[PDB]
Design a protein around this ligand. Structure first.
Ligand SMILES: [Ca+2]
Ligand SMILES: [Mg+2]
Ligand SMILES: [Mg+2]
Lengths: 100, 100
């Protein structure tokens, strides 16, 4: 059996075909087992509509999960993504660093 | 003006909803200007059908490009992706490392 904590990255992207729209991304990579929970947070509150969840694996024991949704951040809203996994005794909250 | 060479990563992923299919990915990140050329290679030859090309930007001067397509690699085929950019005097060829 192998267990590996997700590496977590939080970043925004504008699709080039629709540069006005903006997407908050939480990327979890290299984790096992594949059981996971993830929420995007806006000022500590769960964002209930998350349009996109893309799960994949490379080796049979390495999962990758992209969880993202359109947002419109203001300079005073705090965004983050909260991840639970068996390798994490407490939920892990990673803040969006605007730059990256 | 800012110019930045792409960081290039080549990796495979299986979508979890269709675990049998396999995708070769070439990910170029953080580059500027956005003008770029990229091919996936199989034993040195360009792969002409590349189903997916996802371009985005974060800051106005930082582009991200995911270029990928379904493949069926054998243990003796060599895969790579070849990138041209103004910051690269010669085309850059990054080989697929199966593991990653
Ligand atoms: Ca990615
Ligand atoms: Mg836990
Ligand atoms: Mg060049």
């Amino acid at each position: 059996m192998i267990q590996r904590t997700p590496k977590i990255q939080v970043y925004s992207r504008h699709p080039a075909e629709n540069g006005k729209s903006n997407f908050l991304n939480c990327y979890m990579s290299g984790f096992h087992p594949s059981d996971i929970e993830v929420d995007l947070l806006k000022n500590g509150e769960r964002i209930e509509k998350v349009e996109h969840s893309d799960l994949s694996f490379s080796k049979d024991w390495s999962f990758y999960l992209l969880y993202y949704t359109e947002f419109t951040p203001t300079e005073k809203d705090e965004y983050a993504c909260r991840v639970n996994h068996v390798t994490l005794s407490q939920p892990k909250i990673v803040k969006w660093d605007r730059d990256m």
